[PDB]
From Swiss-Prot:
Similarity field: Belongs to the immunoglobulin superfamily. TIM family.
Name under which the protein is recorded: Hepatitis A virus cellular receptor 1
Complexes and interactors: Interacts with STAM. Interacts with SELPLG.
Main function: Phosphatidylserine receptor that plays an important functional role in regulatory B-cells homeostasis including generation, expansion and suppressor functions. As P-selectin/SELPLG ligand, plays a specialized role in activated but not naive T-cell trafficking during inflammatory responses. Controls thereby T-cell accumulation in the inflamed central nervous system (CNS) and the induction of autoimmune disease. Also regulates expression of various anti-inflammatory cytokines and co-inhibitory ligands including IL10. Acts as a regulator of T-cell proliferation. (Microbial infection) Acts as a receptor for Hepatitis A virus.
Residues carrying covalently attached carbohydrate according to the record: 45
More details: The extracellular part of the protein can be cleaved and detected in urine and is in correlation with the expression in the kidney.
Residue stretches making up the Ig-like V-type domain: 1-101
Localization per record: Cell membrane
Changes after translation: Ubiquitination promotes receptor endocytosis and target receptors for lysosomal degradation and termination of receptor signaling. (Microbial infection) Ubiquitination is required for Dengue virus endocytosis.
Cysteines engaged in disulfide bonds, as pairs: 16-85, 26-37, 32-84
Organism ancestry: Eukaryota, Metazoa, Chordata, Craniata, Vertebrata
Name of the encoding gene: HAVCR1
Organism: Homo sapiens (Human)
Domain of life: Eukaryota
Tissue spec. comment: Widely expressed, with highest levels in kidney and testis. Expressed by activated CD4+ T-cells during the development of helper T-cells responses.
């Protein structure tokens, strides 16, 4: 079970490297939802981000090679919580729960 963080202030990166075909995804700020990201903070359409809730949220990896890891810049204690990387393929998805803890 992936857990990331430590001190508030620095950036933190939540890793997510998926399998299967290159496809669209969403980052959820909250536990993994069953059928979408109920509190989606990042959305991709193919290999490019079409929505991000906060300018602090960046996908810095190679999306064409299935790296949709989320970097949260300028972190604060309140960023602590569970997040979900949800990758949506044709008729199935993969999701990865990640815990963030920042003091």
């Amino acid at each position: 079970s992936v857990k990331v963080g430590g001190e508030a202030g620095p950036s933190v990166t939540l890793p997510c490297h998926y399998s299967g075909a290159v496809t669209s995804m969403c980052w959820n700020r909250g536990s993994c939802s069953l059928f979408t990201c109920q509190n989606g903070i990042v959305w991709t359409n193919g290999t490019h981000v079409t929505y991000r809730k906060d300018t602090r949220y960046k996908l810095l990896g190679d999306l064409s090679r299935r790296d949709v890891s989320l970097t949260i810049e300028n972190t604060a204690v309140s960023d602590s919580g569970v997040y979900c990387c949800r990758v949506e393929h044709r008729g199935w998805f993969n999701d990865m729960k990640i815990t963030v803890s920042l003091e």
